[PDB]
Every structure is written in C-alpha cells, then in structure tokens.
Amino acid sequence: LKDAQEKLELAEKKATDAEADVASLNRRIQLVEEELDRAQERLATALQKLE
Amino acid sequence: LKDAQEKLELAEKKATDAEADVASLNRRIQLVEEELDRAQERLATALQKLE
C-alpha cells in the first residue's frame, strides 16, 4: 500500500500539473490568435493606404 | 492497494491525455506565432513603403 499510494500521489500531481499547463496553453492560443487577427487587419489597412 | 492501482490507472490515463493536449496546444501556439511573425514583417514592410 505504501508504494501504491506513492504512485497515486505522483500520478495525481502529474495530471493536475498537466491540466494547468493545458489551460495556460489554451489561453495562450486565444491571446496569440487575437494578436494575429489585429496584425492581419493592420496589414490590410496599410496595403490599401500604400496603393 | 486495489483502489490505489485503479486510481493510478485513471490518473495516468488523464495525465497522458493532458500531455497530448499540451503537445497539440504548443504546436498551435508555435504555428500561430509564426503566422503573427509573418504578419508583423509585412507590417514593417508596409510602413517602409509608406515612408
């Protein structure tokens, strides 16, 4: 039981950290997508003014 | 020990799933980052053309 509970603890800690990493990466994805959309809009406006 | 092993299996499956999510989300992060880099390079070229 000592080994089994130690394995349980390590697996649970790893899964929780992985979930936190997933949430952080997803919010990073949405942030970077917003920045990309703003950059594309700026590019379009600049090209029109250039022409 | 039986319950501990079952929870170990569940936790390791969930952690592997979240690790795959991490891999996918980091791939998306890098790809959108590259697209944003291209967009900002285009923006810099556009400002140069404005000048």
UniProtKB/Swiss-Prot annotation, chains A, B:
Protein origin, superkingdom: Eukaryota
Compartments, record wording: Cytoplasm, Cytoskeleton
Up-regulation conditions: Induced in stimulated quiescent cells.
Function: Binds to actin filaments in muscle and non-muscle cells. Plays a central role, in association with the troponin complex, in the calcium dependent regulation of vertebrate striated muscle contraction. Smooth muscle contraction is regulated by interaction with caldesmon. In non-muscle cells is implicated in stabilizing cytoskeleton actin filaments.
Domain notes: The molecule is in a coiled coil structure that is formed by 2 polypeptide chains. The sequence exhibits a prominent seven-residues periodicity.
Subunit (UniProt): Homodimer. Heterodimer of an alpha (TPM1, TPM3 or TPM4) and a beta (TPM2) chain. Interacts with HRG (via the HRR domain); the interaction contributes to the antiangiogenic properties of the histidine/proline-rich region (HRR) of HRG. Interacts (via N-terminus) with LMOD2 (via N-terminus) and TMOD1 (via N-terminus).
Additional remarks: The sequences of cardiac and skeletal muscles are identical.
Entry's family note: Belongs to the tropomyosin family.
Name of this chain's protein: Tropomyosin alpha-1 chain
Organism: Mus musculus (Mouse)
Taxon lineage: Eukaryota, Metazoa, Chordata, Craniata, Vertebrata
